[PDB]
Design a protein around this nucleic acid. Structure first.
Lengths: 96, 97, 73, 83, 103, 105, 95, 83, 98
DNA sequence: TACGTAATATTGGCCAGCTAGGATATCACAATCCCGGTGCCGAGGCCGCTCAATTGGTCGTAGACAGCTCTAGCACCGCTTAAACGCACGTACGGATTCCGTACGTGCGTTTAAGCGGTGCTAGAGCTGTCTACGACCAATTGAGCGGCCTCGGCACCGGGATTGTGATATCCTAGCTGGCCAATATTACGTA
DNA sequence: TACGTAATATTGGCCAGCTAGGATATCACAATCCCGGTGCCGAGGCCGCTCAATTGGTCGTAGACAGCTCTAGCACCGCTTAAACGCACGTACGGAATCCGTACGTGCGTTTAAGCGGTGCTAGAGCTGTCTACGACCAATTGAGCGGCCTCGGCACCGGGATTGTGATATCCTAGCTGGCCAATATTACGTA
């Protein structure tokens, strides 16, 4: 038999190919990327959770993720992050 | 007439300010510094007075504890005088930088 | 034990160093070669300060009681 | 317009009193401007977060809670002002 | 899929699932997973960018964890994001203090 | 015994604590024992700090705990000092501590 | 007629009257006490939430609070909080 | 029975290699035992929390995840083991 | 014979070990230390090999960084040699020591 | 008989070369390097199944918005006074310098247990499938906890009198240097053989 | 005329006295402190209305408890190194010791603006009500993402030459000491006044 564990490995690869088509990645390095995404996921999600509670709201909307990103990320990293975020949200709702 | 030796009033001031809990920065200078820094982030901002008291309580607590670490760095270098380099060692180790 | 003046002159003659003897070199010779008190260091320092001013010791390194000196001859 | 010339309201005797409560006996002359830079970096980091919270609440007034939440964000939790 | 509609490589479905199964709030808006999945993808690409660069500088075709570490600790802002993080098998930056050098 | 505090022998409100645990997105479901345990821990730590701060107050000749008494209390107790090691107690000051080398010889 | 702002004040005054029946407490002191109680509340609740999530459980039970207290409190303070919590649960369960 | 005599398995040349990676040129003789005590306290704090996690999972085997969770608890997050 | 001046091989080893990423404590002594420390918390316990590997990665990262800070304290005291007081000052400031 | 002139022997003073202490350039040896070959295993790709994502549909409720209230944030002014400022002055601190002892690093050889690949043995991790004790969700019941209101005892604030610590000044004791006195040695003169 | 002895003078050494410096002790001065008096106001209690907690009933699913599967943790085993260890040796580093200049503490007079408290103005915080767009939830559906399998090129390992850095030696540079050379002075003997 066999047991299923999910990871972001396939998506990290897909993105690696965009930025560096002619380069690959070890399993160890892959496990770090995985840790990194989970960690950053948890950190934004947690901040967004608190923002909602602070404002007495039952919902985590993009606007909470957006503020979360600005409390969390440093300066230049946030600016770009807010862009890609707003961008993808726009493209998504205009493809409904 | 009478003159105390250097370090005598300093030591007296340590004991004095370690006995009390009142803020040591004058309230209006501090407030004007808070409004200026915030102005450079977003214009036309009001402050609850307690929000400025909270920023001052925290700020002074931060500097008191930082001067503690700074003092140990000075003593570590067989000195009695704190220097900018002791602050910088403190902050580096703390991971502030 | 002889006067500190004599013990310093003895320490310089007994150390055939190329640069006479420093205050530290003289200071340790006296402590091992004579029944000297607890205040040996101040008395040596005072004696070198007086022997340089008299011109009994003439200086080869430093400026004052902190340096290296030889006997005049 | 550019705002400037306010940090100096954190005066030499004030920094001295803070140093005293920190147990400092002797203070080099260069410490004062250094402590101003340190406190500005500190106030910048915290007020930035406070305002981010204020912004998100769609307010024009920074609340003590915004600051408290921000201090907590930086690992500098503060008791006695809410929360 | 919601990734295509958003133009992401990262899975919007999985992120919406995790945000609900994670007890972050009662309700999760429809834009939230998209935004978050996009931020995650962006940071991913930032680190892969800089660490493929490290890999090439080091004459490798394949990213190992030292390349991720070189990447993160030479970048100020990534270095700060991961300042309380430890990257298995990544080592340190070569840095000898000046006074230790022979004169 | 109508209240859940009474049923538990607590002074701290088990009901309100159960409310906060639900309205707080900690987990889907909150067990019936959780608020009780938590309200009781909260009560224990509360009493621990009030003990030491009423003591501080009395050493200082005072009928009232002011925040300095809480600070004296917390920072003289090793374990309270550690629980609150990243905490700042408004208006509480510092402990008197002059370094030895700074003392006149 | 100002908005209802909930507080742990009444309980804190109770505990304090059990433990020092002639001692008072100022405004600011009580604000600190209230922030202490909220702070420790959040820290324990948070660690319990993480324990449940880590074990794929949908429920926060007194067992999660208990382990939360053991990870969070230092030695002796934990010991005492654990026994004072188990005592409360045991009661509650029988009555 | 009482357990002891394993910390000295963290040898002098090992502490030396660690110091070198830390950029240390010269090492006092008293550093080695000092580093043994520090490393003991660190492992204690981490393993204690790790075991608390194993206990709660009703297991007899400490998993890498228990350690990762404990490191994270202690503000020493570690990537590459199941983060 | 031949002899490098004291400090030359120290620098060679710094350059060497800041170039690599492999663990610097021998694995089995560390493992036995981990089991010994754990027994004093709960008896009869098994460890995943990856759990010990995680403990060693984390512990060694901690010690390397701590030696960095210690080095800065020593340099602060105009010294080239690290001493227990540098470690104690480092940990004091880090908030580990009191 | 003494003094002067000329001659010989001993002592005195200053200068030069040689020796010791230094830095720069060149030579030799060792360590980190690098390059093309070689095998070895995990990166990475396809494959086909399956479970989590998607679409299409219902229902209820969170919060976006609009309208209204009244809190408290802001501005501004005059007056009191404590705090800040800047300047004078000198102590004690930091740093620059020398200097001495051994605690360090380096480099041998001998001693050891870490590392590896090996087979063998099974605790216990981890997945399924049953079912019931437990918690969500609900309306109806009600009493704990809230704000509003009020008041007096605790304490902040001040002015009078007290205890402890630090600094300065004066006195006493110890050491050093100089001067005086006594003893010993050498030289000269006188007397005797 | 020569030699020996005695006496006198000069020089050196030792002892005693006086002066100067350093250390210790005592006294005074100032700061914090300890004390009731006194007046302002916030802790804390009484009240009564309300909203969040309690009560009892349905109903659904989480998880405990059991039963089975096999993964990974673990144990003893025996060679082959490389890493640990213990030691010889000596240098560069740490620290102790002293010395000098000025920066930083203390105190004073003058200058500046914080704080107070009292007034007057509205932005906007924060709370209500209405209605709907949005997200939870369920049933059905489908392909994205998973593990299992495979294979092959990226990279670890290694042996055989190359480059750079560190350490040591030899050539050129300055200041200090002893000896050498030259000259002076002091003593001697003879001749002349």
């Amino acid at each position: 038999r066999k047991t299923r564990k999910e990871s972001y490995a396939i998506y990290v690869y897909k993105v690696l190919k965009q930025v560096h088509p002619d380069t690959g990645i070890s399993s160890k390095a892959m496990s770090i990327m995985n840790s990194f995404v989970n960690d950053v996921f948890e950190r934004i999600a947690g901040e967004a959770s608190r923002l909602a509670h602070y404002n007495k709201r039952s919902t985590i909307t993009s606007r909470e993720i957006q503020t979360a990103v600005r409390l969390l990320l440093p300066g230049e990293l946030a600016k770009h992050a807010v862009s890609e975020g707003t961008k993808a949200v726009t493209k998504y709702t205009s493809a409904k | 007439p009478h003159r105390y030796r250097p370090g005598t009033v300093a030591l007296r001031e340590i004991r004095r300010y370690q006995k009390s809990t009142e803020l040591l920065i004058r309230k209006l200078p501090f407030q004007r510094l808070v409004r200026e820094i915030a102005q450079d982030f977003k214009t036309d901002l009001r402050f609850q007075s307690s929000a400025v008291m909270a920023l001052q309580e925290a700020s002074e607590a931060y500097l008191v504890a930082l001067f503690e670490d700074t003092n140990l760095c000075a003593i570590h270098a067989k000195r009695v005088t704190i220097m900018p380099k002791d602050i910088q060692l403190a902050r580096r180790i703390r991971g502030e930088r | 034990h002889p006067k500190y003046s004599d013990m310093i002159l003895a320490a310089v003659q007994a150390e055939k160093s190329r640069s006479g003897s420093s205050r530290q070199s003289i200071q340790k010779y006296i402590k091992n070669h004579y029944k000297v008190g607890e205040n040996a260091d101040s008395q040596i320092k005072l004696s070198i300060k007086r022997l340089v001013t008299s011109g009994a010791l003439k200086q080869t390194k430093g400026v004052g009681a902190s340096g290296s000196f030889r006997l005049a001859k | 317009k550019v705002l400037r010339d306010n940090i100096q309201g954190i005066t030499k005797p004030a920094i001295r009193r803070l140093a005293r409560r920190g147990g400092v006996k002797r203070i080099s002359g260069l410490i004062y401007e250094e402590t101003r830079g340190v406190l500005k970096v500190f106030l910048e980091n915290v007020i930035r977060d406070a305002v981010t919270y204020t912004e998100h609440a769609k307010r024009k007034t920074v609340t003590a809670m915004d600051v408290v939440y921000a201090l907590k964000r930086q690992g500098r939790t503060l008791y006695g002002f809410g929360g | 899929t919601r990734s295509s509609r958003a133009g992401l490589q990262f899975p919007v479905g999985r992120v919406h699932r995790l945000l609900r199964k994670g007890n972050y709030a009662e309700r999760v808006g429809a834009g939230a997973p998209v935004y978050l999945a996009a931020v995650l993808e962006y940071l991913t690409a930032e680190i892969l960018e800089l660490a493929g660069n490290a890999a090439r500088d080091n004459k490798k075709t394949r990213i190992i964890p030292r390349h991720l570490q070189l990447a993160v600790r030479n970048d100020e802002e990534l270095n700060k994001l991961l300042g309380r993080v430890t990257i298995a098998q990544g080592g340190v930056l070569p840095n000898i203090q000046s006074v230790l050098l022979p004169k």
